[PDB]
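Annotators were shown the component list below and the corresponding predicted structure, then asked to write short factual statements about the assembly.
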Amino acid sequence: YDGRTGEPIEGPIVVGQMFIMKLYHMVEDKMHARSTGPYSLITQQPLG
Amino acid sequence: IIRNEKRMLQEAVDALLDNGRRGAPVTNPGSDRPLRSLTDILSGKQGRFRQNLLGK
DNA sequence: CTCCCGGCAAATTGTCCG
DNA sequence: TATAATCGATCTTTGCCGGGAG
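Structure shown to annotators:
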């Protein structure tokens, strides 16, 4: 049953228990943004 | 002796401009890493042109 | 002339690199 | 500043362009 409507899904759907893992790649770690910041010595371009 | 000194001087100029181009690459003591000469700085994927100039 | 041989120059990108 | 001492010590991809030798 669709919890939004209450109406059934128009077809029977495969449901069961699956083993699913949370991998080491998490947004908290990867989100990054910069306006201005450190520059490199010789090139004076932003660091990495 | 003066001849030896002169040929060593050429090799010193050679490593400074393009190290490894002719002869054994000059290395810091106790490292196999060739020193990075002016030519190495200009050229290659890591060089001045393709690293800081065509993209930043 | 015509051809191997050697010497030199190249070999994807972001992230990361603890 | 003084016996004499006299020659060193490591090594394992593909495409293009120039040169000497056959």
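Statements collected:
1. The first helix of chain A runs from residue 27 to 30.
2. Residues 22 and 28 of chain A are 14 Å apart (CA to CA).
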